[PDB]
Ligand binder design. Sequence first.
Ligand code: HEM
Length: 450
Amino acid sequence: IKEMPQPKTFGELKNLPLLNTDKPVQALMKIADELGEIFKFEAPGRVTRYLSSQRLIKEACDESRFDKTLSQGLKFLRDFLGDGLATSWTHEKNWKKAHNILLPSFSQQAMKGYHASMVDIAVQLVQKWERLNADEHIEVSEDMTRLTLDTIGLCGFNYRFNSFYRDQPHPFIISMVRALDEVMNKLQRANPDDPAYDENKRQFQEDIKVMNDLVDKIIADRKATDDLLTQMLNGKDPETGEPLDDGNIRYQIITFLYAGVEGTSGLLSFALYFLVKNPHVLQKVAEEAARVLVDPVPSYKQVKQLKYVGMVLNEALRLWPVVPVFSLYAKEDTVLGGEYPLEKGDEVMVLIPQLHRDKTVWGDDVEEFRPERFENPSAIPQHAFKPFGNGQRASPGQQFALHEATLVLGMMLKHFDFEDHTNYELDIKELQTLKPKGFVVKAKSKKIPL
Ligand code: HEM
């Protein structure tokens, strides 16, 4: 039975000032590197424990001992995501119902139905890059976000955001990013009732209205005229026979569009970054892309044969898991690793970037980008790789995300050579999800028609 380490406290503010940064997850990684596999973190009125080792995280991932909790971050996201799937307690009224109703929208049959829409948007991206002049460059994170929002819009809702017909981000992206930024600010605010924050609160309500205005256009357009929206509006819970309430449906739509703005866009941006920084890996992916993608547009079967592209995407998720933390609570009194006693309700945070750098399960070379790590998935120890979370509360979008990401990276490397023309230094923007900031490249067309 050991005493848990804790970083510097600041009187009544406890540890809160340590995360007074634009990069709090990166700050928590530095604390983990100082204090080791577990440390206590206190803020006014709340305590959590950050886990960094596979040894402790494997116990946290035991669903008989631990269930999902909402971090302060996820609690604030309920301001516009409500009790959608991601921001619901496991035993809250709409979690199990929504989970059951939306399950067949991620079926193998659903995935085959989505492929044609993913190709539509991927073709738009390739055509944009083909039409750039010699003196121009690509804003990588920006164009990856255009693609992922358009893909979930078309695949999920038969709605065209038409992000490639806009120089600035779609108003929905502008408002969602501004809302996510306000939540990052709220996590650092000790005195939220201060009148100095009245303008912030007004702007927050305005951004929530813009997002709700778009949800109205998606529903109106469906009324005017078989996908995720069909299942939301018409699907009934097989257990109870009850459909989703109109209010919950709206929260689910914004939740799935949030997957469109953050997550897959981060992965694709991180993936291209690692490729331009590791030219031998880029050459290998370019060779696979050329060999497998023999048709003008990729088939479902051809995307499944892009094996090394899959390994590249997994190695991007290892180093920079784009959803970097998930939170759990002790269902009963328990002892973590035979050293740390927890009371019922005690909260733990899985620091995924630190888990993915645990030398005891990954070896010495944890900082090296080596997709060859994932040549044999079965050789990776249990609970050593958790970019999609854990158990019944794990990502339902894993297959969707990796299919989209494989298709896009495959086509990109089939159609273009890439130059890191500015010698870009990785700068990671944090919104409770991770994405490169200011990442720019030049593309050279291989002149292969679509
Ligand atoms: C690289 C891409 C993605 C990553 C890394 C990712 C990661 C995650 C993680 C870690 C969680 C668990 C969060 C927690 O325990 O608090 C999660 C939940 C979820 N993800 Fe994903 N995700 C990705 C793509 C997607 C996509 C494309 C969709 C939808 C189309 C999606 C929908 C969801 C939903 C609805 C949940 C909540 C599930 C529930 O609790 O019932 N994700 N995701």
